[PDB]
A paper describes a structure:
In the four isoforms of Numb, the PTB domain is present as a short version (PTBo in isoform 3 and 4) or a long one (PTBi in isoform 1 and 2), differing for the presence of a stretch of 11 aa coded by Ex3. In this study, we demonstrate that the sequence encoded by Ex3 (11 aa) is responsible for binding to Mdm2 and recapitulates the effects of holo-Numb on p53 and p53-dependent phenotypes.
In the two crystal forms obtained, the canonical PTB fold was extended by the insertion of the Ex3-encoded sequence. The 11-residue Ex3 loop was found to adopt three conformations, all characterized by extension of helix α2 of one or two turns. In addition, the “canonical” phosphopeptide-binding region of the PTB domain was remote and completely distinct from the Ex3-coded region. Indeed, by a variety of approaches, we were able to show that the peptide-binding cleft of PTBi is not involved in the interaction with Mdm2.
Author numbering:
A (entry chain H): 1 to 7
B (entry chain A): 27 to 169
Write the structure that this text describes.
């Protein structure tokens, strides 16, 4: 973790 | 502490930048793990060899802000990586390598996913991953 702002 | 540092562009971590490798997914704890063991086996296979190898770990200092991650070589102080946070997919520590931290990101020219591994010198991987999460948050929130 964590998840990113792309996608 | 760290969180207040990221927003104020004051947050830093002493690191060793291992380098980048193509990875097949945008997110994933094992995708990261894999990328770490690849770089560690590229550096290792080439040990003893006297000469420039494509891929030699580099001592540097990592800066973490809401705008991007930057790794500036401590030795030459050249900005080696200036990565915008908005084209960053994922980040993570390593389940079996406690000092390891990496982040996946999209590269739109090559149209591919790219992992970026580091080994922290004074800190644990999760402190770094957390810091970059604060970056992720700050980014997501005003937008």
């Amino acid at each position: 973790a964590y998840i990113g702002p792309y996608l | 502490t760290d969180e207040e540092g990221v927003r104020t562009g004051k947050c830093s971590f002493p690191v060793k930048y291992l380098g980048h490798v193509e990875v097949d997914e945008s997110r994933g704890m094992h995708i990261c793990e894999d990328a770490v063991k690849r770089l560690k086996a590229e550096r290792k296979f080439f040990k003893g060899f006297f000469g420039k190898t494509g891929k030699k770990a580099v001592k540097a200092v990592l800066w973490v802000s809401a705008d991007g991650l930057r790794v500036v070589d401590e030795k030459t102080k050249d900005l080696i990586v200036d990565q915008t946070i908005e084209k960053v997919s994922f980040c993570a520590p390593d389940r079996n390598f406690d000092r390891a931290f990496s982040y996946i990101c999209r590269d739109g020219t090559t149209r591919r996913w790219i992992c970026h591994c580091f080994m922290a010198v004074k800190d644990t991987g999760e402190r770094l991953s957390h810091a970059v999460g604060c970056a992720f948050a700050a980014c997501l929130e005003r937008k």
